[PDB]
Design an enzyme around this catalytic site. Sequence first.
Site, PDB file in Angstrom:
ATOM      1  N   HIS A 141      18.369  36.654  15.392  1.00  0.00           N
ATOM      2  CA  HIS A 141      18.635  36.117  16.726  1.00  0.00           C
ATOM      3  C   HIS A 141      18.367  34.622  16.776  1.00  0.00           C
ATOM      4  O   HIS A 141      17.229  34.210  16.992  1.00  0.00           O
ATOM      5  CB  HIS A 141      17.639  36.718  17.719  1.00  0.00           C
ATOM      6  CG  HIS A 141      17.813  38.179  17.975  1.00  0.00           C
ATOM      7  ND1 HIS A 141      18.582  38.672  19.011  1.00  0.00           N
ATOM      8  CD2 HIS A 141      17.270  39.256  17.361  1.00  0.00           C
ATOM      9  CE1 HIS A 141      18.519  39.993  19.005  1.00  0.00           C
ATOM     10  NE2 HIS A 141      17.729  40.373  18.017  1.00  0.00           N
ATOM     11  N   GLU A 157      13.655  47.233  13.132  1.00  0.00           N
ATOM     12  CA  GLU A 157      13.515  47.861  14.423  1.00  0.00           C
ATOM     13  C   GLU A 157      14.026  49.253  14.168  1.00  0.00           C
ATOM     14  O   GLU A 157      15.203  49.414  13.892  1.00  0.00           O
ATOM     15  CB  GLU A 157      14.324  47.175  15.525  1.00  0.00           C
ATOM     16  CG  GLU A 157      13.711  45.868  16.011  1.00  0.00           C
ATOM     17  CD  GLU A 157      14.495  45.304  17.171  1.00  0.00           C
ATOM     18  OE1 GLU A 157      15.516  44.636  16.916  1.00  0.00           O
ATOM     19  OE2 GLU A 157      14.102  45.533  18.342  1.00  0.00           O
ATOM     20  N   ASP A 202      14.615  39.945  13.461  1.00  0.00           N
ATOM     21  CA  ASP A 202      14.151  41.325  13.442  1.00  0.00           C
ATOM     22  C   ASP A 202      14.373  41.983  12.095  1.00  0.00           C
ATOM     23  O   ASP A 202      15.433  42.524  11.816  1.00  0.00           O
ATOM     24  CB  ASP A 202      14.792  42.124  14.572  1.00  0.00           C
ATOM     25  CG  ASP A 202      14.408  41.581  15.915  1.00  0.00           C
ATOM     26  OD1 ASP A 202      13.197  41.333  16.092  1.00  0.00           O
ATOM     27  OD2 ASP A 202      15.216  41.388  16.849  1.00  0.00           O
ATOM     28  N   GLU A 252      14.343  34.520  16.547  1.00  0.00           N
ATOM     29  CA  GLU A 252      13.690  35.759  16.161  1.00  0.00           C
ATOM     30  C   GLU A 252      14.475  36.382  15.026  1.00  0.00           C
ATOM     31  O   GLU A 252      15.703  36.477  15.098  1.00  0.00           O
ATOM     32  CB  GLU A 252      13.681  36.712  17.362  1.00  0.00           C
ATOM     33  CG  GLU A 252      13.023  38.055  17.096  1.00  0.00           C
ATOM     34  CD  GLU A 252      13.052  38.986  18.301  1.00  0.00           C
ATOM     35  OE1 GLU A 252      13.500  38.565  19.400  1.00  0.00           O
ATOM     36  OE2 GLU A 252      12.593  40.145  18.152  1.00  0.00           O
TER      37      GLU A 252
HETATM   38  O1  LIG Z   1      22.127  46.807  19.907  1.00  0.00           O
HETATM   39  C1  LIG Z   1      22.641  45.480  19.822  1.00  0.00           C
HETATM   40  C2  LIG Z   1      22.640  44.700  21.146  1.00  0.00           C
HETATM   41  C3  LIG Z   1      21.384  44.935  21.983  1.00  0.00           C
HETATM   42  O2  LIG Z   1      20.416  43.991  21.549  1.00  0.00           O
HETATM   43  C4  LIG Z   1      19.151  44.465  21.119  1.00  0.00           C
HETATM   44  O3  LIG Z   1      18.280  44.592  22.230  1.00  0.00           O
HETATM   45  C5  LIG Z   1      16.956  45.050  21.980  1.00  0.00           C
HETATM   46  C6  LIG Z   1      16.185  45.062  23.289  1.00  0.00           C
HETATM   47  O4  LIG Z   1      16.128  43.725  23.775  1.00  0.00           O
HETATM   48  C7  LIG Z   1      16.287  44.096  20.990  1.00  0.00           C
HETATM   49  O5  LIG Z   1      15.018  44.644  20.656  1.00  0.00           O
HETATM   50  C8  LIG Z   1      17.156  43.921  19.740  1.00  0.00           C
HETATM   51  O6  LIG Z   1      16.604  42.986  18.809  1.00  0.00           O
HETATM   52  C9  LIG Z   1      18.549  43.468  20.139  1.00  0.00           C
HETATM   53  O7  LIG Z   1      19.392  43.324  19.006  1.00  0.00           O
HETATM   54  C10 LIG Z   1      21.619  44.732  23.488  1.00  0.00           C
HETATM   55  O8  LIG Z   1      20.421  44.886  24.251  1.00  0.00           O
HETATM   56  C11 LIG Z   1      22.624  45.756  23.983  1.00  0.00           C
HETATM   57  O9  LIG Z   1      22.907  45.492  25.350  1.00  0.00           O
HETATM   58  C12 LIG Z   1      23.842  45.587  23.134  1.00  0.00           C
HETATM   59  N1  LIG Z   1      25.095  45.873  23.481  1.00  0.00           N
HETATM   60  C13 LIG Z   1      25.847  45.581  22.415  1.00  0.00           C
HETATM   61  C14 LIG Z   1      25.061  45.122  21.428  1.00  0.00           C
HETATM   62  N2  LIG Z   1      23.817  45.143  21.890  1.00  0.00           N
END
Ligand SMILES: OC[C@@H]1[C@@H](O[C@@H]2O[C@H](CO)[C@@H](O)[C@H](O)[C@H]2O)[C@H](O)[C@@H](O)c2nccn21
Length: 431
Positions: A223, A212, A209, A207
Site C-alpha cells: 500500500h 494478512e 502487508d 504499508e
Molecule cells: O481486498 C482488497 C481491497 C480491500 O482492501 C483491504 O482492506 C483491509 C481492511 O482495511 C486491509 O486490511 C487490507 O490491507 C486491504 O488490502 C478493500 O477494503 C475492499 O473494499 C476491496 N474491494 C476491492 C478490493 N478491496
Amino acid sequence: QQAGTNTAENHPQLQSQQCTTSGGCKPLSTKVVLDSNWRWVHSTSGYTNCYTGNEWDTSLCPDGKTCAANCALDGADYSGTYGITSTGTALTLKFVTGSNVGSRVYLMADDTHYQLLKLLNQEFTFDVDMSNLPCGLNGALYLSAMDADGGMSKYPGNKAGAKYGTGYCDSQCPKDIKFINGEANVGNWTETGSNTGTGSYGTCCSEMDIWEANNDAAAFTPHPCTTTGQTRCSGDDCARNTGLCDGDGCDFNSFRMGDKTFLGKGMTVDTSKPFTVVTQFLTNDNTSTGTLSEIRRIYIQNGKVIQNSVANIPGVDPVNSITDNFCAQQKTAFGDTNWFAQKGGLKQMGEALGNGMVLALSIWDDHAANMLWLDSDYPTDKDPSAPGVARGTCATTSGVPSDVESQVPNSQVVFSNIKFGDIGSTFSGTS
Ligand SMILES: OC[C@@H]1[C@@H](O[C@@H]2O[C@H](CO)[C@@H](O)[C@H](O)[C@H]2O)[C@H](O)[C@@H](O)c2nccn21
Ligand SMILES: *[C@@H]1O[C@H](CO)[C@@H](O)[C@H](O)[C@H]1NC(C)=O
C-alpha cells in the site's frame, strides 16, 4: 502522551535472525511492544482514567494538547490482560482475553526503539500457525512507515514514545488512534464500539502487508501513500484511496487470483499445520538503490519448497508475483481503480521500504466488513461469479465481531522463526 509509572513496562523477548549470503544467520535480541491504543491512560498525578470504555474524560482532556499533558500511557500485563505471550522465538497472540479483544505489537531493537527494517533487495521470512485462526479473524504481520522512536523526537507532546507503542500509522489513515502527533485525538470524538471511537484526525503512512490471513485465506499487499512517513490527516486527506493513501493496495490472494485449491485446510499450503512464509522484495537492478520491481512469495511446509500459486484470471497474465504490470491487469480485471498506481506503485512502496519500516504483528476482527474482503465474497452486492469478487470460502454471514468474539474467543495466531536479510539467505535448499 506522558509515560506512566504505575505499572512497569517489560517488553516480551522475541528473538529474530539477521541473515547474509556469506555469513549465514545470526540472532538479534529483539522484543515486542504493545500498541498505545490498548493501554491504560490515566492522569499523570494519579490513577484517574483519562479514557474509560469509549469516551475521554472531558475534565482531563478538554482538548488534544491539554489531554496529552495531563495523561500518561502505562505498562501492560501482556499475558494477563492481552493474551500475548512469547517463548522467546514464538509469539502467541490470543483473540479474546476478558473484555479485551485482539492486540497489536511492534518488533523492538531495544526498549525505546522499534527495529527499523530496510528490505529493499532483501527478504523477510517467518513461520505461522493458523490452525486455531478461523473465518472472520486476521492474524496480520506487516510493515508500517512509523518512526523508530514512535514520534518522540517529532512531537513535543509525546514523552512516551516507542517504549509504549506510540506513533502508529497505516494505509487506512485510521482515525480511531487515540494519540497522534503528540496530541490526544479527542476532536469530535465519536463512539464506534464499546471500547473504541474516532476523532477528527487520522494517521497515514505507506504499508506493506506481508501477511494478512486466517486458515481459510491469505493475502499479501503493498500500500503506497503519496506522503513520506507518519502523517496526520484531516478531512478528505484521510479518505481511503482518494486521499493520501492507497487503502485497497495491490493484493495477491491466491483464491482471489483464481486458484481455489492452493491454500487452506489440507491444500498445497496446508493451513491446519504450521508453515514458513518467505517474502522477497526484488529491485530492477538487484541493488538496494534500485526500484522495487517484484514481490515474490515462497512457502515451505514439511520441508517441501512451494512456489506461489499462479494467477488464473482472464485479462491477467498467469504470473505468481506482484509487479506493477500485474497490478494494472488485476485492477482492470476486477473493476477496481488503480489507486496503487496513482499513489506511485511499487516504486513508491519501495521508497518507503528503503527508508525503513516497523514490523507490526496483530490479531483482529473487522467491524467494518467482517473480514469478508479476506475470506468471502466482496463487495456483498457484486456478483460472486465476477473476477475478483470471491476471496475465500467463508460464509458471507461470517466474521461478525459479536459472533466470533462469543463463538471462538480462544482463537490465536502464533508467529515464529522471524528472519530477514539477503535474498535467498533466510532459507536453504538441497537435493
Ligand atoms: O481486498 C482488497 C481491497 C480491500 O482492501 C483491504 O482492506 C483491509 C481492511 O482495511 C486491509 O486490511 C487490507 O490491507 C486491504 O488490502 C478493500 O477494503 C475492499 O473494499 C476491496 N474491494 C476491492 C478490493 N478491496
Ligand atoms: C537480478 O536477479 C535476478 C534473479 O532473481 C536475475 O534473474 C536477473 O538477471 C538479475 N538482474 C541483473 C541486472 O543482474
